[PDB]
From Swiss-Prot:
Organs and tissues of expression: Ubiquitously expressed, with highest levels in lung, kidney, heart, gastrointestinal system and prostate.
Residues of the full protein shown: 645 to 1230 of 1306
Name the record gives this protein: Angiotensin-converting enzyme
Family note: Belongs to the peptidase M2 family.
Other comment: Inhibitors of ACE are commonly used to treat hypertension and some types of renal and cardiac dysfunction.
Occurrences of domain Peptidase M2 (ranges): 1-578
Organism of this sequence: Homo sapiens (Human)
Residues the record marks as active site: 345 (proton acceptor 2), 474 (proton donor 2)
Residues where Zn(2+) 2 binds: 344, 348, 372
Biological role stated in the UniProt entry: Dipeptidyl carboxypeptidase that removes dipeptides from the C-terminus of a variety of circulating hormones, such as angiotensin I, bradykinin or enkephalins, thereby playing a key role in the regulation of blood pressure, electrolyte homeostasis or synaptic plasticity. Composed of two similar catalytic domains, each possessing a functional active site, with different selectivity for substrates.
Binding partners and assembly: Monomer and homodimer; homodimerizes following binding to an inhibitor. Interacts with calmodulin (CALM1, CALM2 or CALM3); interaction takes place in the cytoplasmic region and regulates phosphorylation and proteolytic cleavage.
Annotated site location: Not glycosylated: 581
Modification after translation, per record: Phosphorylated on tyrosine residues on its extracellular part, promoting cleavage by secretase enzymes and formation of the soluble form (Angiotensin-converting enzyme, soluble form).
Consequence recorded when altering residue 376 to E/A: Decreased dipeptidyl carboxypeptidase activity
Length: 586
């Protein structure tokens, strides 16, 4: 009966709101106050949500979706039929939860020590070294040490993790965990579509790579940089070489056109974490989008506590599944990078608020990439030299062609450099999950892809027992990553569309959509759909067409592509890494 299915969905919604809200609370209380007691309560709520998922998922599977007429009810019931880890038998579920906790803990407590010296945590100690050191051996100590202490220590857990997460996927009707993850996009052509996008960005990435490689050759010396080979992976300013903007000082196109030190400016002018989030809130409401509720300001953790609590510091945004309580947890630091992260996280909060009236089963983004993109779209406008000057964080940089190319290079060092990294992570994981990479070659296959996609090599030859993927957070925390590749493509599509809605003309990279109500209306209509419709509908609401496309990103960076090609040609660069077998001699 249509009526029995409707009743079921209503009962699922009521009970899920209660159970998910209790789990969100317990998880928040652990994350903002790590103790034995909060771990204990969290463990109990984890089991309560499993029992709820098992109960309602079992019921949902008794419905023949084929016989359901109402498409919304059909959609919800089909989704509740996927129990995820709660499909595992009791022993395997306990084992899986424990392996996940052990991997996450191992990663979070790993430190790198000098003998009879200080021990450095990843954040901020080791990331600061990677960002600021310009000494090959000091960078190497941090890069190798982090892999030695975090990566190698995850390896013992990962094969059993793969076995259990695949078993859960098969018990929910998928062939492996990678299949299950890809299904979140509801797009049978996903793999080919993503490959096509990656290929469209190759001219830009290869030209950026070759230009940066030449700059590294200048600084680190001819004996350590092969101008026809891959770049050593510890020289890009970031522990994973996923974004390169911390080496802007080594690659600036026009050193004669200097830029203000934005961190020093923010500190001198008394910026605080709360001010950073108020600025993000203001951008959202300038578009006519929703302000965060008063409760957000009361309950959020917007900087590291000084009351003796120990906390999880990573930036994060939290839906408590009651339509009222939304929070950010971030150990915010006062700099421009974290101002952008604040906008990223506030985009997650905005999406939570926009879809709060849907059934909790449809309270997700159109696809996971959409959820990641919203905040970054606003941050693109924030990052314009125009807007940064209005915050008193830059001197006037408009007009000047040199400042213009310098700005596009700054943007490309993050946005373009990240495209191959964000593609790589789940290309590797999909092949682990489908069994075509075994524990015998986890690491070799990781580096084959680091080479193939990013054009990087490890500065020190890897050895047996190395497990460098484990040194990247999302691997031991089992967080899918292709969402970030999707996000970095489509956020430029959204920027282009909103800039057009706002009446912007001229180069896309000069657009600042601040206070555009037309831009806000486009985003709001799409966000309010949550996960109720196939994501091409939200794509069309924003952009006027239904596809993912790299064209907007290419248009944004067109002046840099032209500059890079001219620069690389006059130095005779050989794009790519035909000497792909090269690795450092010392
Ligand atoms: C197939 O079934 C689906 C699902 O049906 C729903 O679920 C099943 C299981 C059963 O329970 C059904 O009884 C139930 O309807 C059908 O899809 C639904 O279709 C109805 C149309 O009949 C749509 O009605 C709209 O719903 C919105 C949102 O409603 C939530 O939020 C409201 C605001 O907080 C609140 O009032 C509601 O009670 C509801 O509350 C939330 O409910 C969810 C669970 O669903 C729960 O998780 C949340 O916790 C809970 N939140 C809170 C806070 O309680 C409602 O806002 C709409 O009102 C507008 O539209 C009317 C029609 O146009 C109009 O008369 C109203 O005045 C109002 O109009 C707008 O007003 C503004 C300003 O005044 C104006 O600017 C706008 O232009 C104007 N809109 C206009 C003119 O269009 C309305 O009631 C459901 O949204 C929809 N649900 C989903 C999920 O899609 C589907 O129709 C079925 N298909 C077929 C072919 O039959
Ligand atoms: C805890 S939750 O699950 O309930 N809520 C999720 C978000 C809603 C999911 C909806 N279903 C959440 O808070 N997640 C945390 C995660 C943290 C960040 C993260 O890891 N970023 C990746 C990739 C990246 C992204 C942007 C960028 O510029 C550079 C890199 C990384 O750093 O490698 C670190 C700061 C930027 C995001 C996030 O916000 O997406
Ligand atoms: C951090 O967590 C501990 C453990 O839950 C909290 O301590 C509890 O505090 C309440 C009073 O509010 C007592 O009723 C419990 O008995 C306490 N338990 C223990 C083990 O001490 C503590 O309040 C939390 N701190 C913060 C700042 O939230
Ligand atoms: Cl690595
Ligand atoms: Cl994803
Ligand atoms: Zn995010």
């Amino acid at each position: 009966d249509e009526a029995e299915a409707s009743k079921f969905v209503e009962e699922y919604d009521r009970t899920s709101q209660v159970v998910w809200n209790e789990y969100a609370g317990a998880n928040w209380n652990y994350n903002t106050n790590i103790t034995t007691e909060t771990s204990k309560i969290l463990l109990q709520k984890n089991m309560q949500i499993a029992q709820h998922t098992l109960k309602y998922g079992t019921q949902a599977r008794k419905f023949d979706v084929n016989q359901l007429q109402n498409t919304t009810i059909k959609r919800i019931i089909k989704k509740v039929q996927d129990l995820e880890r709660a499909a595992l038998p009791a022993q395997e579920l306990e084992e899986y939860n424990k392996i996940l906790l052990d991997m996450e803990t191992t990663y979070s407590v790993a430190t790198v020590c000098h003998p009879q010296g200080s021990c450095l945590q990843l954040e901020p100690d080791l990331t600061n070294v990677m960002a600021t050191s310009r000494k090959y051996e000091d960078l190497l100590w941090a890069w190798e040490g982090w892999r030695d202490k975090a990566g190698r220590a995850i390896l013992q857990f990962y094969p059993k993790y793969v076995e259990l997460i695949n078993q859960a996927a098969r018990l929910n009707g998928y062939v492996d965990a990678g299949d299950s993850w890809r299904s979140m996009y509801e797009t049978p052509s996903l793999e080919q579509d993503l490959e096509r996008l990656f290929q469209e960005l190759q001219p830009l990435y290869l030209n950026l790579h070759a230009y940066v490689r030449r700059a590294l050759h200048r600084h680190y010396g001819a004996q350590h940089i092969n101008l026809e080979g891959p770049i050593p992976a510890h020289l890009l300013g970031n522990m994973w070489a996923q974004t390169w903007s911390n080496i802007y000082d080594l690659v600036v196109p026009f050193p004669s056109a200097p830029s203000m030190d934005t961190t020093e400016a923010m500190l001198k002018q008394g910026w605080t974490p709360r001010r950073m989030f108020k600025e993000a809130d203001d951008f959202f409401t300038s578009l006519g989008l929703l302000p965060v509720p008063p409760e957000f300001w009361q309950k959020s953790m917007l900087e590291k506590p000084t009351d003796g609590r120990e906390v999880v510091c990573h930036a994060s945004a939290w839906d408590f599944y009651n339509g009222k309580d939304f929070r950010i947890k971030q150990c915010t630091t006062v700099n421009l990078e974290d101002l952008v992260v604040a906008h990223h996280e506030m985009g997650h909060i905005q999406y939570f608020m926009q879809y709060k009236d849907l059934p909790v089963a449809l309270r997700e983004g159109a696809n996971p990439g959409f959820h990641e993109a919203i905040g970054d779209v606003l941050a693109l406008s924030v990052s314009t030299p125009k807007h940064l000057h209005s915050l008193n964080l830059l001197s006037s940089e408009g007009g000047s062609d040199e400042h213009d190319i310098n700005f596009l290079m700054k943007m490309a060092l993050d946005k373009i450099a990240f495209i191959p990294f964000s593609y790589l992570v789940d290309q590797w994981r999909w092949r682990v999950f489908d069994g075509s990479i075994t524990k015998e070659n986890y690491n070799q296959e990781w580096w084959s892809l680091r080479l193939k996609y990013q054009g990087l090599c490890p500065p020190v030859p890897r050895t047996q027992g190395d497990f460098d993927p484990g040194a990247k957070f999302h691997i031991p925390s089992s967080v899918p990553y292709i969402r970030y590749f999707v996000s970095f493509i489509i956020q430029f599509q959204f920027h282009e569309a909103l800039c057009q809605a706002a009446g912007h003309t001229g180069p896309l990279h000069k657009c600042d959509i601040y206070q555009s109500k037309e831009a806000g209306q486009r985003l709001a209509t799409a966000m309010k759909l949550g996960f109720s419709r196939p994501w091409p509908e939200a794509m069309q609401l924003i952009t006027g067409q239904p596809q993912m496309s790299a064209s907007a990103m290419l248009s944004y960076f067109k002046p840099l592509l032209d500059w890079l090609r001219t620069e690389n040609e006059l130095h005779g660069e050989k794009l790519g890494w035909p000497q792909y077998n090269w690795t450092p001699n010392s």
